[PDB]
Amino acid sequence: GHAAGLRAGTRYAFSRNFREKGMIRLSTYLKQYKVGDIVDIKVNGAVQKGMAHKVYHGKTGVIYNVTKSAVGIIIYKKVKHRYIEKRINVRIEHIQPSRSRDDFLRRVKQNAELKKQAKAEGKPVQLKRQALLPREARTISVVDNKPETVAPVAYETTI
Amino acid sequence: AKSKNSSQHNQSRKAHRNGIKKPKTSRYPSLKGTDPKFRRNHRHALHGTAKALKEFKEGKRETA
Amino acid sequence: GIDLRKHHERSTHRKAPKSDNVYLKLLVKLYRFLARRTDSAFNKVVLRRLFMSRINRPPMSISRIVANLKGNEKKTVVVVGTVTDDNRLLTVPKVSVAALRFTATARARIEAAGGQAITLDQLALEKPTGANTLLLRGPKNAREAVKHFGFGPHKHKKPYVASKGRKFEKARGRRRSKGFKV
Amino acid sequence: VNVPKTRKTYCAGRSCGKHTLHKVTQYKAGKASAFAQGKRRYDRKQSGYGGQTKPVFHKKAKTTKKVVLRLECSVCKQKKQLPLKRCKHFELGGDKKTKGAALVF
Amino acid sequence: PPKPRKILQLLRLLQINNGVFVRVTKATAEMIKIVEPWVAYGYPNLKSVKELIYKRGYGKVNKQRVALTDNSIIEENLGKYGIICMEDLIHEIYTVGPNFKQASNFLWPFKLSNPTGGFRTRKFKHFIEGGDLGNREEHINALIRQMN
Amino acid sequence: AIKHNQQIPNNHFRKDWQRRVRCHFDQAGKKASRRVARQAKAAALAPRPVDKLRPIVRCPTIKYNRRTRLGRGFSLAELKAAGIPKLVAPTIGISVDPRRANLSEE
RNA sequence: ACAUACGACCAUACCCACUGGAAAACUCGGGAUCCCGUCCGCUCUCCCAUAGAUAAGCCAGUGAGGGCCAGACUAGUAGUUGGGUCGGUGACGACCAGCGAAUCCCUGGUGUUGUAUGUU
RNA sequence: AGGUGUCCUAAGGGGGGCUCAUGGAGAACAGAAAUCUCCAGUAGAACAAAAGGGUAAAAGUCCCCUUGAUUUUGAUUUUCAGUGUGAAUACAAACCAUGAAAGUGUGGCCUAUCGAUCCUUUAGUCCCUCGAAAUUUGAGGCUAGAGGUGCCAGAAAAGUUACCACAGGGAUAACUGGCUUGUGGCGGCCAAGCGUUCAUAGCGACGUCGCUUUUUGAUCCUUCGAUGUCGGCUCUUCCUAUCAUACCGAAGCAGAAUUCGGUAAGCGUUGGAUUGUUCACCCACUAAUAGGGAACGUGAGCUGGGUUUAGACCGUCGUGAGACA
RNA sequence: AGACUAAUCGAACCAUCUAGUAGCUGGUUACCGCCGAAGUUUCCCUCAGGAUAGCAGUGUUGUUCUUCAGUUUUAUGAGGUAAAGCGAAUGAUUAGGGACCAUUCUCAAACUUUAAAUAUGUAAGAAGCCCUUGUUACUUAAUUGAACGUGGGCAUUCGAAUGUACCAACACUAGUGGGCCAUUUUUGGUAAGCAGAACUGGCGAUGCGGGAUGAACCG
RNA sequence: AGGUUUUGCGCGAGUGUUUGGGUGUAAAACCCGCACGCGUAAUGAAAGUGAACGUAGGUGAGAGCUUCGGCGCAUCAUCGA
Ligand SMILES: C[C@@H]1C[C@@H]([C@H](O)CC2CC(=O)NC(=O)C2)C(=O)[C@@H](C)C1
Ligand SMILES: [Mg+2]
Ligand SMILES: [Mg+2]
Ligand SMILES: [Mg+2]
Ligand SMILES: [Mg+2]
Ligand SMILES: [Mg+2]
Ligand SMILES: [Mg+2]
Ligand SMILES: [Mg+2]
């Protein structure tokens, strides 16, 4: 609109939480990123060098280039009627590995273990995840707890 | 004569008429724009690997 | 009413040649029968290429035939198009080429080398299914017009300029000394 | 804006190719050859009965000019230009600032 | 709206009085909850499944709507999964079998008629509040008789 | 009024060109009349040849000097060497060119 | 298990007050030629490791301590997505299919852990 | 609700030491404010300049050394057509700065602080051209800056027309109509007080709920190939929120006069001086001299006083042509 | 008097340049079949117009074990709105009490310790995973790593559901660039059949049954 | 008239007779050839220079063919020369 520069509307997005501002934990610098990793961008306002625009804050992408203290990220930006490849140079201070990819990577390793174990044992196993299924028949015992009869309560109390 | 200033009405319906398509990615992404040190070395790494495969296929090498 | 997004959508591919060539009509009739009454996927492709226009059947040279014919010798080269002669090829080996057209120079040199310069109706006689055939296509994107398609900033395409010189498109948007570069 | 008379910067003089001490002055636009091709062409167009033939800039918005420094190498003896930002009251005197000094009324 | 439009396309309900069979686990349950203002659903019984397929059951053969008048169509299309007759097809639908996805997708969506006698004064309300939309649990059989 | 990816026009048609359009419908008629004129000239000139003898000259630029063509007339140096008076050659069908000069013996 | 050096999470670890601390370590400590830096050997720097001390730092325990952390209640409440030719003059509200918070009062807890070297 | 067209050789770069605003206690002049000491002090200070983020052995403050505010072109981001301009990010190759070092530095902690073609000028190119040949001036070229377009993707630009003209617009004003009712007008609810005492005979403040379209606003839906634009005269009819007349209720109704209210619009509601006047203000009569509507009823019904072309005068304004609810 | 100068005068009449220019008004000629919009982005002495991109048609081609999705599930992020809070920071604010302290009533578009619903990014594999080993001028103290591979092993249960009644790309070009209405949210205004926005659906471009009647309402 | 994209056609590293000449049943038809236009080489402001390390390269996909082990057109992506 009237003012359309960078950092416009980032009063809360680029700030820091109430009691965790000040010094930046050093575990961020000790994480190691390879090409092909999937990372989440979360701009830290305490470091004003090498930020990413507010559109990419909270987005996720694939690392494509690794340089000294920053990495390149390929992010698909929706621009009206199409998506556009966007290559973002963002410092390792503004990113973190995505746990969704890690959860997938523990699953792909696990699927190999069950398939290897099943083939050696000699029975087939299911690898695909299955959504929640309708409940089967079950019997409920009332030997300890019996049903409690509850009825709607009167308006009674005005306050 | 004043007019209507802006409108995002009908802009989402216009976009989805031909879908919002992501561009297709090939197996080998472009290495232009990567680190120059890595990029120069990768040129030599591929050149040597091609030579090694050629020698192994021809017969001068038996390690591939 | 039914919730459909498209109605009466037509096939995007040509189903019959636009040519009024009576001889080409006979050729299509032969390959309509062959493609229908045989399990040869080669016949279907040859039938489809007979429909195509002239920009989709670029000419091929004997040199490009020779380049691809190794070690595919003892196979019949099939080109649905025109086979042209190459001056830069000093000698022509013995080849078997079946094509819609042969230039007079190309037909003479192939036959002089001791090879076969046959048509597609002759090909359907001894090879009704493309038993030992090499189906080859000319360079599609080698046309001058394709050099202009998709012109835009940072596209490295050929502009529509009526002359070549230091003028007419060399100053602004072509070098940083005059404004900017593209 | 205060700039020192000397500064050590890169000299691309084909003989130094490194940081050398430079003499810093202020670039004044020279003027003006009367036989420049633009001046010859303009004079002939103006001559005759047409009147005034080319635009004359009347408006004005800028109150400043970018200061361009001429840096002269102490060894190669070749020059180098280095523009600055827009400013008023530029000086090369180099009367250094004093911190913690008493104000004078 | 666009989101309910997409779900009705994914459930193959492109017309009014169009019926499909759906196995509910969790993903299909959350899809149907969105499009409740447009659909009525329930739990069919053996007669409902059997009479639907015999009378209004057509197959999807080479993207064509082909009437199931003899077992040859079912054998030549669903034969790979052990379904070779109408009874096999009906059994795979009523009892949710391993090849329910292929059997259900083989059936063209059922093109039912308007109910005879129905529906009621206000049709586009939830079945709980005197309407038709939503989950009439076991009452879909009475509706199917009217519409089939 | 440029609208698309066009080539910028160069049509010099802004000077009331329609008054000076020359259409050559008499191309066939002029050719027939030229042949009639040629036949009349040959009949009057018989038995002399209808044209005159001309020398071989080399074309005058680096692009065309590789080729020779017919010149206007024989130079005075050529005529004197051949043993023909300058004012006799025109009477016997030889073209004379006093302006031309010979810088080479070949 | 305890101590020390370097850490990780960065208050369950912080702030105030009281009490206690075997072995070793940490510390306070003694001196000002050289290195070094100050208005001042206060800090920093260098030398001593003998003398003295757990007074302080440090650690531990205590406090119906302040705070912090977690739970319960608040509450199926506030709010909100979709629906009706629902109610109401209206402001607004109920219902159907779903999602679903946050205070005040109340209760419990008061660091966990890694590498390396040692400890009676 | 505010800001920019600037400012800085440091307020840029590196390194080291320290902790700020404030409060308490204490010391000669000295006090509420001078300087010195201790304790507490999560930033409540400072960071050129608006505001918002950010920062504590610092990004603040003091000290030491410097010019990375340099050279070479590329890749990427924001505005985006994924064009330009501005600004920004991450690398690479030099030459440097700082520190013991890891490292950091390509101007200002981050978000604004700015500019094409042509032309001129400067720096560099030991460079290329002046086309019959050669030298030297001169001129033209290539790469990078500057000179500026603030209407800031960049024309070189004063008025008046009441003498006026054309193409159009109801995309757009002036007159009716349409929605709205602030404003105007009218009507209710409560009850502090006024009324000799007594809230409610008659009023009713502070509040608050409405109705009408007879005022004026607001808007711009219809009309710009035109709906003749004020008032008056004449004439008809309609509304009630009733001035008079009919019949009644109430009174701070003894009579007379008067005030409030109910049914009720059947029937009336004037003659004049001044003003074009609507309105107003007087004189006089009268039972009374009520309020409104019908395209602000009514110009192929009138009149033309005003308004509302062209002539002319005055005052103010303008150098002037000319302007003036 | 801008008066008169052949019914012509704030510059006569006649012929020509001349078919002067017009982003403005009007008109624009048979039938059927198929597909079928926009009043939006950026720039413009731009605001009654253009260029540009978007929406559309046609012609194709690679192909036709083509691939994906206005969708749900599972896993995992971002946000600072509704609500809530003030015996918590900032700001506003009522009252008493004890010697500033402990309390008390009411608030915040440009306040906040907290914090939803709806929407929103990514992943759910063959371009994948494991073992050995090869190349390099990059990196490491280092044949340690990084990137790309040879040779082996995992098979169509190849690693959620549903659908595929949308495979992908290209060329050329039209019209459009005045919009309007409604549920929900929301700004200026006393309000408006007022002016201006967000998502979605409609009318324009659309007939049909109902709302007597009506561009938007219901079916 | 000059462009551009697409369709049909002829020739094809060439292509185009018709400025002109010969001839003619006479503004037709037929024949002829030199130059020239476009293309075959680009890039620089210019002086100028001027396109193979290699089966005209490697990797992945790829219709089709297959002697079933493989070869793989066009085209796209990528690393090179
Ligand atoms: C104002 C002055 C002149 C200006 C320039 O000569 C104006 C030109 C622009 C061009 O398009 N042709 C025009 O006729 C004049 C230049 O750029 C400025 C820095 C300094
Ligand atoms: Mg945040
Ligand atoms: Mg910076
Ligand atoms: Mg508009
Ligand atoms: Mg139909
Ligand atoms: Mg003169
Ligand atoms: Mg009946
Ligand atoms: Mg520091």
Ligand SMILES: [Mg+2]
């Ligand atoms: Mg930019």
Ligand SMILES: [Mg+2]
């Ligand atoms: Mg550096």
Ligand SMILES: [Mg+2]
């Ligand atoms: Mg600073």
Ligand SMILES: [Mg+2]
């Ligand atoms: Mg110049």
Ligand SMILES: [Mg+2]
């Ligand atoms: Mg400039």
Ligand SMILES: [Mg+2]
């Ligand atoms: Mg502009």
Ligand SMILES: [Mg+2]
């Ligand atoms: Mg004028």
Ligand SMILES: [Mg+2]
């Ligand atoms: Mg006028």
Ligand SMILES: [Mg+2]
């Ligand atoms: Mg006027």
Ligand SMILES: [Mg+2]
């Ligand atoms: Mg008005």
Ligand SMILES: [Mg+2]
């Ligand atoms: Mg009112």
Ligand SMILES: [Mg+2]
């Ligand atoms: Mg109006």
Ligand SMILES: [Mg+2]
């Ligand atoms: Mg209007």
Ligand SMILES: [Mg+2]
């Ligand atoms: Mg009008």
Ligand SMILES: [Mg+2]
């Ligand atoms: Mg009219």
Ligand SMILES: [Mg+2]
């Ligand atoms: Mg009228």
